[PDB]
Amino acid sequence: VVGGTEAQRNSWPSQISLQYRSGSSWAHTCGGTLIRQNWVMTAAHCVDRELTFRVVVGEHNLNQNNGTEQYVGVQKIVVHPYWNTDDVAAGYDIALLRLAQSVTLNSYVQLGVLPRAGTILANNSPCYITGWGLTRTNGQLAQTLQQAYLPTVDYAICSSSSYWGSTVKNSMVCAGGDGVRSGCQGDSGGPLHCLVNGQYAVHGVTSFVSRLGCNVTRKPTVFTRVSAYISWINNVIASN
Ligand SMILES: [Ca+2]
DSSP, rough: OOOOOOOOSSSSSSSSEEEEEEEEEEEEEOOOOEEETTEEEEEEESSSSSSOOEEEESBBBBBBBOOOEEEEEEEEEEEETTOOOOOOOOOOOOOOESSSSSOOOOOTBOOOOOOOOOOOTTTOOEEEEEESSSTTTTTOOOOOOOOEEEEOOOOHHSSSSSTGGGGTTEEEEEOOSSSSSSSSOOOTTOEEEEEEETEEEEEEEEOOOSSOOOOTTTOOOEEEEGGSSSHHHHHHHHOO
């Protein structure tokens, strides 16, 4: 997250860290949201590769013990059937992970609330992005969970030529674009929490930013629109 602030430990308890085995260590690669006790939602491009993955719930500081973590393996990865590793702009940047065990819910560890199917936000709706991804373009990961206020940019404005053009589809949410605050590599797969009727619901999955750089004026961070996938989500979860 570029231009963020540290989150309080218990602000965003649906946030997870998606980590892969790197020698004999585990490094952060992506975020994700806990959607059931044994199901994580993340981006398809995070799990494109042949790596060994783990999920950390209850994480606040990547580098230090919090006293709250639960560490769990990934049993099955289900990527969306239309996802094409060579075209992120085509969309379907969404993957569901069945974990090796159920996690225990507590104040650090809660499920993420998902929008009702078809839901579209108004322009300039209040949302926060969270993640441990790079805090500058070509910079480094954060140690502690950062948040940024990142208001929405509706489709008519986001698919306008000054913004994203035809690169963004109606199956995506756009948020931010102020040049100062954004998502960045390592935030991918993570939540966009948006305030709706007094409750924060996860409306996005962080997908892509500009090749020019993470915080680019009029290149808002782009999200997979969670409300476009609600039937797919539930169909996966019933059947696995
Ligand atoms: Ca920790």
